[PDB]
Amino acid sequence: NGRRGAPVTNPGSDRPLRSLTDILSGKQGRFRQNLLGKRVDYSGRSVIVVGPQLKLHQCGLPKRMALELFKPFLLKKMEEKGIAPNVKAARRMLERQRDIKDEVWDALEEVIHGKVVLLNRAPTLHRLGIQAFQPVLVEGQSIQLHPLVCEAFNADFDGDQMAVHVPLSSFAQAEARIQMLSAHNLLSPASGEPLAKPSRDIILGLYYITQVRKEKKGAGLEFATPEEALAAHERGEVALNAP
Amino acid sequence: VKLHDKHIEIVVRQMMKYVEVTDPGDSRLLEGQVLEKWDVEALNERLIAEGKTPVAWKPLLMGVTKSALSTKSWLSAASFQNTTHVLTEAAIAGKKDELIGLKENVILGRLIPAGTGSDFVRFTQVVDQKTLKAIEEARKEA
Amino acid sequence: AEPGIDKLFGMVDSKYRLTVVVAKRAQQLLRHGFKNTVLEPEERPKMQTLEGLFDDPNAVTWAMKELLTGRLVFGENLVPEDRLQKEMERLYPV
Amino acid sequence: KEVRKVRIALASPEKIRSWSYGEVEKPETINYRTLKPERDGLFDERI
Amino acid sequence: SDPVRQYL
Amino acid sequence: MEIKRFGRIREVIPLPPLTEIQVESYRRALQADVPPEKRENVGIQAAFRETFPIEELVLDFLEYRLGEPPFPQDECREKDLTYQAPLYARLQLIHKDTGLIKEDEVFLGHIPLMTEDGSFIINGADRVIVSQIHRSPGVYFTPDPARPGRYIASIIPLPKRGPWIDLEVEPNGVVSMKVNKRKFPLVLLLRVLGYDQETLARELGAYGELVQGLMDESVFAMRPEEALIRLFTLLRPGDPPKRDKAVAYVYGLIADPRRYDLGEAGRYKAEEKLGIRLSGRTLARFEDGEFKDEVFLPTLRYLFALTAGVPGHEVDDIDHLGNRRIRTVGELMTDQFRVGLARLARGVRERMLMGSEDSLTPAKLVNSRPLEAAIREFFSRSQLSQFKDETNPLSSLRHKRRISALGPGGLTRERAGFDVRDVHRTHYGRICPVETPEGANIGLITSLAAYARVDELGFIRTPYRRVVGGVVTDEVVYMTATEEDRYTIAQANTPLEGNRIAAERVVARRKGEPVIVSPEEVEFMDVSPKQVFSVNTNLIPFLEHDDANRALMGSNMQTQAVPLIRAQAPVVMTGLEERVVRDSLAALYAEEDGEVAKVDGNRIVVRYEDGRLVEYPLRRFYRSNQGTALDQRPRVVVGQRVRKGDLLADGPASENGFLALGQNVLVAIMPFDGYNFEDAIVISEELLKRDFYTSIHIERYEIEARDTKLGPERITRDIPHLSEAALRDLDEEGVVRIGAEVKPGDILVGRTSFKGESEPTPEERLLRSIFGEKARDVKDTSLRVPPGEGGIVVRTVRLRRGDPGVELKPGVREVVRVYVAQKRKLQVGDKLANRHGNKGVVAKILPVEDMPHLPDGTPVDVILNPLGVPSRMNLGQILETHLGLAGYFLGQRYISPIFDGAKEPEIKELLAQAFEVYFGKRKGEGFGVDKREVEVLRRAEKLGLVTPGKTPEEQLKELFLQGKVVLYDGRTGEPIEGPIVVGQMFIMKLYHMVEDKMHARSTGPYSLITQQPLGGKAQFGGQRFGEMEVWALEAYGAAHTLQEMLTLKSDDIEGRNAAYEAIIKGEDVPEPSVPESFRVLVKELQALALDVQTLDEKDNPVDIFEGLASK
Amino acid sequence: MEKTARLLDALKYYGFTFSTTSGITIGIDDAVIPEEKKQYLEEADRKLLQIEQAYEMGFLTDRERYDQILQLWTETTEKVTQAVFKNFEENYPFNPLYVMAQSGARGNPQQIRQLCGLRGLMQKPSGETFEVPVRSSFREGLTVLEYFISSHGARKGGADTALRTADSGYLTRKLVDVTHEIVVREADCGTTNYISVPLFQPDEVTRSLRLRKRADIEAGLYGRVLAREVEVLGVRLEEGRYLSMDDVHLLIKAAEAGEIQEVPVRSPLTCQTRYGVCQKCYGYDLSMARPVSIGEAVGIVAAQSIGEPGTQLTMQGLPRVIELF
DNA sequence: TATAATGGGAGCTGTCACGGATGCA
DNA sequence: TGCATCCGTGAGTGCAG
Ligand SMILES: Nc1ccn([C@H]2C[C@H](O)[C@@H](COP(=O)(O)OP(=O)(O)OP(=O)(O)O)O2)c(=O)n1
Ligand SMILES: [Mg+2]
Ligand code: NA
Ligand SMILES: [Zn+2]
């Protein structure tokens, strides 16, 4: 439709109808919108937040997100201990909030042991808009980003958000930890330079303590003996660091 | 922007991928026809083999856009740009996409031919010595 | 980082071959109940529950440690596939 | 067997017919009362 | 070029 | 507390009524308040006058009237109606042959009405009609981008009221003309106007360059009506050139003031441009048998004299604000009205020549619907009818003053280049240069300057004082861009003795370039600095110390200020905080002098001196468009004596009548152990304690019960398989009780729908066979609450049909709405911002024992991080703290006028005076200097903040005036090695809270054709893993993780189901099969007659449909 | 990696506690307007009418005037920018702006100059510069008119980051499409062809050879693989060897000495691997500073590596890149 | 199912840049 | 034959919508 001549419009609107080629092609077409990348299950989004207490390979996943993104795993575990008899009743527990009992969460913490999730940030410009983290569960809603990896993501905390995706297979785990964990990707693949490096506060800190005072009092006198220079200094006429 | 020359080369190398014929020697090609530098070098061996004349060819420099569109894999090209022009010319020629690249296999959804999916590494086996010798000894005598 | 990774990449010829050896061994374990492990009980990865310390469930952490011992063999074209998926269901049942 | 290539080519009229399970004869969708598909139109179940 | 003016 | 002002600028006039561009506009189009006789031919009227009278029988227009609305403003908000008035129009039919006279007043529909503040109500949601900017009607010349010495001339009417035309003088000497992109020699056209060879040189007669080239007598050898038919062939390749059809086509394009209208503007602009009076808004006339040109030769006169070099012939700058103009709301809708009217006229004449040409009235010759529909359209799907922004009251006011370049009539995003978006010279004091959005709409959507107004022609004009001699008159006049350019105009703050220009160098603009000029040469003077910026921008204190690119964020970010339950006006104000609460029409004032009768959380009644007893009721806890509690609170007490215009209740985000966008807090500016990192923010738990930054929010949860082809849906308390605990808050009918607590999972309204032809299948008919209950025939469709939502049921609305007053969309029995509330404490993730563009997320809430604190025990509230300031370049927030320090200890607030505020000395003065209170209180209360305050002072001396060899008091004094104080870390008692900046800041809670954005799904809805997961928090989405994310995984080489994304996590229906079964069974997930969306790709290529084919390595097909599409 | 991981958290922990206690802040008084200023401000008007007078007496034209009006004001800005850092380093070496810009924690001289010095010349919509600069600082405060003039600049700059962004994206996407099938498919293609990476730049300043800038040489050499032997300064770099970062620095030295002019390297410009590239012709997997592992999608890495910077390329700018690709 | 009736009607407007196929001194 | 000139095609990510 519309390729040749006027386009076929339903009545009372001017919207060209969507013809077979229009489906196939375009940024909105079948290829670019459903074959070269879909939507996905086991994924979440939230506001990020700096956690400077994290180790390089970690992140702050709020526990309400955690539950869902692992909901199958949590149903099976919920049996193997027995916070429910079978998995179907296990699900009906977590479907209203009240019904979540404490040892549900202790149950979860078993679930996610060892395995990582993925963080994704807004424009995935390079291989590093996605990196792997062991989640540590937390209360509150916000994701905790490690400060060193903010650079690759170009993530400040003006209110940016991030995506979470759970890998599933024992293969998709072994891919995330070996190849895509933050702590293993420290040099840029473009320049080969380091990319997890110190930035704003971290170098502000180490500068301030490795800088050296340069005092202007003594102005560089010529004293032939220590014993008197000291004397001069306890006289108050020459500052400690003046050269 | 410190950025390794090799990346830019990788690309440029794909801009240079193609060549124009300038005398078809003893081949089915045609003066002006374009084709991958690879595929002409390819049969210019089958022709130095049957000892006949070789294709005369000529280097071609294409921009990146035109070079993606001219790829072999019509599944890659249709999913990039100029979707019909690609799609028709492919169906006329009854092209078959070999599924050599990434896009191709991403649209089908198969394990891409890179990383954990490279044939170099995907067929690797692992056995504990307490099982590599458990199967090696029943199978030493018929 | 991952504990011991730097030496892992040393063993294999290409980082991705580690990843599949790990993931494969790491599923050999998930299906067999770990009976085939080539660890001893004190090297056993262990997680800490609210009740008490127990075997690490993450079959991948296992597989990695498992690999560092040297007690595993990796490589291409080493067995018939069907002669392993049974001899191992034999030595350690499902 | 396992997919390994993907061929694209013109469908002959007889081939188009090969695929088809019935001539859509009527420009009808679905019955304004039973909200079920009119037979011989675009949603017919015998096709 | 315009399918009415043609029939007209 | 005291309110100390600064500022030397005696502003002459005040801000004008800030919604006049919305209200003045619509009213000057309705006239519903003018006796029809006294109406004037603009707006709703002029449209009638244009389409009428209808022609062969004839039907002529007498007058229209408007009736009051069938329901009051609030009644429509509830009942999802429109706030509209019935439109009657009196007509008289008269017979083209006999003298017939009938006269009915036929009803045309409902015209929607605009409320007091500038908004509309349309199916019960407030909306705004954003004025639109567009190139204005008129005739222009602009050089040809090809031939550097020849210049296109162009002729442009109002949108869709005539065609564009260019007069490019070709490279072949004789001058061309383009209409519907159809070029041809201009000459042929001048002929048709009755033009003669001689009277061209008799009018051109100077430029033998082309004047003599324009003439080519393969044309002159024809009478006027001869070329008339000549050209009908040139634009209609095929139509029979009858001398009835050609006079009709031309006319219907160039002389028919019914589809060719230059603006009322277009007239004047082309008039003064070509310096000719213009009978009507039309290029040509039909008068006394033939065509009498009006505009073509004058235009042709300019163009020629320019392409030689004549004086007074300048190209025009189409981005000047004299050549652009504003289609205000009233004009925008009469456009849509003039298109409904013209459609109704296709519907009369149709029934004027088929059906009975004598037994006819106006009543039955008019189908009101073509009108009713174009109006319903304008307000319900225009680009320019936007959901109102009533986040806080500033948001609604800033909205009404928006200016879009986009929309029907203007620019398609792709059509938008650079010149449209740039700040033009002539924006000065008409359109704000700050207030605009970051992103793709930058420079298209903008804001009205604060003193600026739109004249009757649609141009923006701004005020200026007239200076004579060198004394400055109190007589103000508003100029259009064009006349401004005529004068030398002194700067807002050029200094004066009394009212004489007291300097000898005065800072002035001549056509927007800055010139230094003596007070002899000075004609006008800016009214104020407030006149150059948005309203919002005028809310930024210390603006002149704020780089522009963050002024803009602090500007926009205000309209996102959630209204806080303890809101307070900023300690440092700019002087508008009061008008804004006024014109926002959200606070509530005193109509005349009087005394106060009663007072109450619900109403405020006041006896007046007129004896009248008005009873202002209080809009208490009303849910805004954006969910933000729009709450009116009372500010007087019984018997209070109130002069006129005093206050009687604070609106939301107003404190005693001042715009309270957020709270004033004790802020320390110092890195804090990582929780400052990259604009993150650390806050004192003592904030949630005193309920600072708390806000109330509401969501509507609506449900219908409808008649079905399987039974009726029922709103019952009787839901199958549900435990009483799971209903302990529902009333008899199935409604939660007003005042319950509801959380995720909880039923809000039980409901039952009937099961289908899957009425229990065997598997199920048996499971019940064991349990003694047989299969039940209805279904739980109860409206639960969504994940991560909830609160306290505050109201319910139940509308059935069969009840009075009520009738809902067909087939729906009953519709129940339950409004839920929440008190939102501040929590870790919410966004805070200040008026200077410092924005950040709350990353950490320390308990007060960890907050840095002053010697005298007081803990700070906010620790911002100094790394924000340097690269950001927004220094105002630095000064705003310092003057906040002083205020904090004097107990004062300040009014620092933009660009004319308190300067550094005036303020370091105020800090001294505070120091006295903070320390002199001390060295008398029995304590001296402290041992840590010295160790810090030791350091300050190495830095250079203090003069060495001075009493500690002397030095602490010196640090203070630098706005710096000693700070003890609460984790150690040890002092901060340095002296810190600590002060009082205005900081809003933004609308973007973690609560509204945390979301996650394991598995949920899928899409009909693709079987890929739905998208969006509200659908219970999946996260779109895009081309760019796939690349990412690709570059890592995570084939299995990517494949997963592309099969079991999205649409590999087989392995997807297979997986989730594998997890709950404790098994590893299964290797996947072909995604379903690829199958759709196959079938969709068959439907295009292409035979796609999966093949194995030996080239024989492979059925990815497992035989289900073979026979 | 494992240790650098622990190293990295380490530098994170202490650097973070230190920043807080040390007590860095910002008060208005910390943008120190160097007194050298009005020496330089005054010295300007005199030299301004010293060219408003080689025109006031019609000496040379308006198109000559404006040209030298802003050759003056540009080298005025430079002067007072320096004065702001001399005044810092000699007198307040620990003032927070100085400290922040100096370590690389924030700021650069040019912004900082606007806090303390003067704002500078501003842009006019067209693209031309106002001959009237804004002499105010941000500490000092801008005149309304000053503020306005300064606005054409930023608006024209926002618009830019918005249209630009769409081309980087689009460009990046073409790049991925034309390279996605490139993977490191085999170990050695046995190719015996390579490329000379010139360490010397055929100048026209002296139109001699000037050694090439270090980083640009690092750019063409780091993590390559030699395809012939090299022997420079008693060292033997063998055929086959992956130039480590130090390998590179040694080759610059030997070039500074005259023993070498162009290293022969195995580039992918010449791998004969079909549909991919060998390990050798590639080189290091820069993310690991070691030989690339067979199966890396280096094409996709390339595309990502080249796209990601254009945002972020201010003109020619990114245009010129697109004109070449 | 019968007076007679015999060629339409709205266009829409301010982007851009490249590459390929068609027309013309 | 060389070069106007027209027609068709593109024009960043995700999220709220
Ligand atoms: N249309 C958009 C809007 C935003 N971004 C991303 C890119 C960046 O992550 C951030 C824009 O950078 P900023 O201007 O917000 O500030 P930076 O933190 O990147 O630089 P600085 O630290 O000086 O503020 O938002 C993007 O890619 N495309
Ligand atoms: Mg950000
Ligand atoms: Na930032
Ligand atoms: Zn090679």
Author numbering:
A (entry chain D): 584 to 826
B (entry chain D): 1361 to 1502
C (entry chain E): 2 to 95
D (entry chain D): 3 to 49
E (entry chain F): 78 to 85
F (entry chain C): 1 to 56, 64 to 1118
G (entry chain D): 924 to 1238, 1254 to 1263
From the study:
RNA polymerases (RNAPs) synthesize RNA from ribonucleoside triphosphates (NTPs), whereas DNA polymerases (DNAPs) use 2′-deoxyribonucleoside triphosphates (2′dNTPs) to synthesize DNA. The mechanism of discrimination against 2′dNTPs by the multi-subunit RNAPs (bacterial, archaeal, and eukaryotic nuclear RNAPs) is poorly understood. We identified a conserved Arg residue, β′Arg425 (E. coli RNAP numbering) as the major determinant of the sugar selectivity. In summary, our data show that the universally conserved Arg residue plays a central role in selecting NTPs over 2′dNTPs by the multi-subunit RNAPs.
To further test our hypothesis in crystallo, we solved the X-ray crystal structure of the initially transcribing complexes containing T. thermophilus RNAP, DNA, and 3-nt RNA primer with incoming 2′dCTP bound at the active site at 3.14 Å resolution. The structure displayed a well-resolved electron density of 2′dCTP and β′Arg425 closely approaching the deoxyribose moiety. 2′dCTP was observed in the pre-insertion conformation that was unsuitable for catalysis because the α-phosphate was located 5.7 Å from the 3′OH of the RNA primer. The electron density was consistent with the interaction between the β′Arg425 residue and the 3′OH group of the deoxyribose in the 2′-endo conformation. While the resolution of the structure was insufficient to unambiguously determine the conformation of the deoxyribose, the 3′OH of the 2′endo conformer was positioned to hydrogen bond with up to three RNAP atoms, whereas the 3′OH of the 3′-endo conformer fitted into the omit map could only form a single hydrogen bond. Considering that 2′dNTPs intrinsically prefer the 2′-endo conformation in solution and when bound to RNA template in a non-enzymatic system, these observations suggest that 2′dCTP predominantly adopts the 2′-endo conformation upon binding to the open active site of RNAP (TL unfolded, see below). Interestingly, the density for the metal ion complexed by the β- and γ-phosphates of 2′dCTP was weak and the coordination distances were longer than typically observed for Mg2+ in the corresponding position. We modeled this metal ion as Na+ rather than Mg2+ similarly to what has been proposed for DNA polymerase β32. The TL was completely unfolded in the structure of the initially transcribing complex with 2′dCTP, in contrast to a partially helical conformation typically observed in the structures of RNAP complexes with non-hydrolysable NTP analogs. The destabilization of the TL folding could be due to the absence of interactions between the TL β′Gln929 and the 3′OH of 2′dCTP, that in turn is an expected consequence of the 2′dCTP binding in the 2′-endo conformation.
